[PDB]
Every structure is written in C-alpha cells, then in structure tokens.
Design a protein around this motif. Structure first.
Motif, mmCIF file in Angstrom:
data_model
loop_
_atom_site.group_PDB
_atom_site.id
_atom_site.type_symbol
_atom_site.label_atom_id
_atom_site.label_comp_id
_atom_site.label_asym_id
_atom_site.label_seq_id
_atom_site.Cartn_x
_atom_site.Cartn_y
_atom_site.Cartn_z
ATOM 1 N N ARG A 1 -3.212 4.789 -2.129
ATOM 2 C CA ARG A 1 -3.397 3.983 -3.345
ATOM 3 C C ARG A 1 -2.698 2.630 -3.237
ATOM 4 N N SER A 2 -3.203 1.660 -3.999
ATOM 5 C CA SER A 2 -2.611 0.335 -4.079
ATOM 6 C C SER A 2 -1.257 0.387 -4.776
ATOM 7 N N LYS B 1 -9.341 -3.083 -1.911
ATOM 8 C CA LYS B 1 -8.561 -2.823 -3.122
ATOM 9 C C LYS B 1 -7.377 -3.778 -3.241
ATOM 10 N N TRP C 1 0.813 -1.209 0.000
ATOM 11 C CA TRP C 1 0.000 0.000 0.000
ATOM 12 C C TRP C 1 0.857 1.273 0.000
ATOM 13 N N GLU D 1 -8.446 -7.368 -4.149
ATOM 14 C CA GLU D 1 -8.923 -7.355 -5.536
ATOM 15 C C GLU D 1 -7.810 -7.219 -6.574
ATOM 16 N N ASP D 2 -6.756 -6.477 -6.240
ATOM 17 C CA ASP D 2 -5.572 -6.433 -7.096
ATOM 18 C C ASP D 2 -4.837 -7.770 -7.020
ATOM 19 N N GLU E 1 -11.733 -0.230 3.175
ATOM 20 C CA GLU E 1 -11.945 -0.111 1.738
ATOM 21 C C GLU E 1 -10.608 -0.252 1.003
ATOM 22 N N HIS E 2 -9.523 0.120 1.682
ATOM 23 C CA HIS E 2 -8.182 0.063 1.107
ATOM 24 C C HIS E 2 -7.605 -1.358 1.023
ATOM 25 N N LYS F 1 -0.728 -2.585 -8.312
ATOM 26 C CA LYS F 1 -1.612 -2.608 -9.483
ATOM 27 C C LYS F 1 -0.974 -3.264 -10.712
#
Length: 328
Positions: free
Chosen positions: A68-69, A145, A61, A148-149, A141-142, A72
C-alpha cells in the motif's frame, strides 16, 4: 551543512541485487525489461534498466501485507522528507554496489570514487524526477499509485492556477533533493581513504529524456561487458590452439561462443531502443549517442555487431571478434 554523523536507515531498501548479489551471494540479477505495448516519452516501446527495477522508494511505499501507498495522508513537506531520505539511501546503497565491484559498470575514476557510481547515482536521480513528475513508465501499478498520491498531495497543498503545479513543485525542491545526494557522498569520507570528498564529485548540480537516459545506461553496460568478453577471448585464443581439419577449439571456442550468445540476446534490446531513439531524434545516430558518452563504446561498430544482412552470419560467426576467433 549536511547531517554528517547523524545516521538514518530506512526499511524496504536493502543492498542492491540488480546485476547480482554482492559476494558471497550469487545470482539474483535482473534483466532489461523491454515492452511493446507501452509508451515512454512521446512514443511506443521501452527498455527498463535493472537498476530502475531496484530503485529505493523508502517510506513512500508500505510493502507489508500485500502492499500500500505510505503517503496517502501526507503533507507535501513530509512527502519531500520521504523522497529526500529515499534518494539519500539510494546513494549509499549504490556506493556499496560499485565500491564492492558488483555493479557491471564498476568491473577508480577520477575524483577517487568507485567507477560507475556517479553515473548510477545521476541515473537514479533522473528516475526519481520522472517518478514524481509522472513522466516515466507505467510498468508498476504500485508506482502508478505513487505518482497519483503525489499529484493529489501537491494539488491540495499548493495554490491552484494541474500537473503544471507538480512540475513547478519539483523544480522548487530539486536543489534540496540533489543535496541529499551530495550529503550522502560527503558521508563517504567516514568510509574512504582515496580522497577528501566535498560532495560535488558527481556534479554540483543535478543532471543534465529518461528514454535517452535509459538507452545511454544500456550502452555503457553493453560496451563494458563487450570488452570483458574480448578480454576473455584474447586470454583463451592468445596460445594459438587450433584443431586440424584449422578450426578453433576448447577454451578459445568456449569464450567465443559466449560472446556470440551474448550478442544474440542483446540484439532485440538494441533494435528496440535504437529505433525509438532515431525516429524520435531525427538525423541523430544511436551509435553516436553511446560513443560520444562512453569511452568503452569507441571500439564498438554497432551496425557491424548487430548487422542483419544474410552474409554476416556465415562470414563473421563471432561478429566483430571473428578474427581473434579464427585460425591463423
């Protein structure tokens, strides 16, 4: 072999604060976060450990500029590397947190490591597993992410047959991830005179339901804190200073009221977790779960402590410590 003298620190993961800042720092402690409208495991509810809320995500992170991730565009090899470094850093910071006596569960057993350190390390490892598998809790929520990545990295980077691949991928890297823990423990030798550490002290293999794992941590913490309250009650009520009417007074009543207050706040947490555990694991007791795992829980009658009958408040003002917190 491990990266013995090869040092590597990561930004974003500073000294732990979850049970409070390390002395001379004060406060900054996190509380257990219990939520109604959330699913954990099969069912409703969840109480989130302070420690989990402090989990080192390292280079996964990017906290800078609103967050942001940082994975990615990563290959699954570089993702694995970033997890391994996070796990390695978590182990080091947990060691400091329990070595300094700051972690509640550490306040020296038996391979010569700080009390509670292995439990905490096992617990964080389970948290990393559930984060990667996408089987934990959607509170952040982070991290949503992140799972999901992770899911998309694994699916692009492995042959298709699907979070079934994510599950197999974890299994394939699990031994290596656990070696990051063992490696960090080996590096304690550089730091510690108590014993020789081969890295197997918290288990040669990774441990061993995250909801059960969280509830067990809650229990160990509660029982240890409970015995500290007893300790202070006995030091202030044992001296038999009772004011004539005899009703307890002064230091004794203070320490007794501290425990009464503690039990009242912990009650909601017990109820939530006990209910979730016992009506998922049919015929199993929440009381047994804790008592069979932690010796500090043996003297705890959880049904008495958190009892919800009408008479118990009046007859037992300080719960299971009412007799020490009485006159005569």
């Amino acid at each position: 072999s491990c990266d013995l003298n090869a040092t590597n620190y990561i930004r974003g993961c500073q000294s732990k604060t979850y049970d409070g800042k390390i002395f001379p720092g004060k406060g900054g402690e996190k509380q257990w976060i219990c939520k109604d409208t959330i699913i954990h495991g099969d069912t409703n509810g969840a109480c989130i450990p302070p420690r989990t809320q402090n989990l080192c995500v390292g280079e996964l992170w990017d906290k800078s500029y609103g967050g942001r991730s940082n994975i990615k565009n990563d290959t699954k090899e570089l993702l694995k590397e970033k997890i391994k470094n996070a796990i390695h850093k978590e182990t080091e910071l947990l060691y400091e947190y329990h070595d300094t006596g700051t972690a509640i569960i550490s306040k020296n057993d038996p391979n010569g490591l700080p009390k509670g350190f292995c439990h905490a390390v096992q617990r964080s490892f389970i948290d990393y597993k559930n984060m990667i598998l996408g089987t934990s809790v959607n509170i952040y929520e982070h991290i949503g992410k992140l799972q999901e990545d992770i899911k998309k990295i694994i699916e692009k980077g492995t042959p298709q047959q699907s979070t079934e691949n994510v599950n197999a991928w974890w299994k394939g890297i699990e031994r290596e991830m656990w070696d990051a823990v063992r490696c960090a423990i080996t590096k304690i030798n550089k730091k510690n005179n108590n014993s020789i550490f081969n890295g197997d002290e918290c288990g040669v293999s990774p441990p061993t339901d995250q909801s059960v794992s969280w509830f067990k941590e809650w229990g160990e913490q509660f029982c240890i804190e409970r015995l500290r309250y007893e300790q202070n009650i006995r030091e202030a009520c044992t001296e038999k200073k009772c004011i004539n009417s005899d009703k307890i007074q002064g230091a004794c009543k203070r320490k007794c009221e501290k425990y009464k207050k503690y039990i009242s706040e912990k009650k909601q947490e017990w109820d939530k977790q006990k209910t979730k555990y016992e009506n998922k694991y049919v015929g199993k007791s929440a009381s047994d779960l804790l008592k069979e795992n932690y010796p500090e829980c043996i003297s705890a009658n959880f049904d008495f402590i958190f009892n919800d009958n009408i008479e118990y408040k009046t007859y037992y003002p300080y719960g299971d410590y009412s007799s020490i917190c009485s006159c005569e």
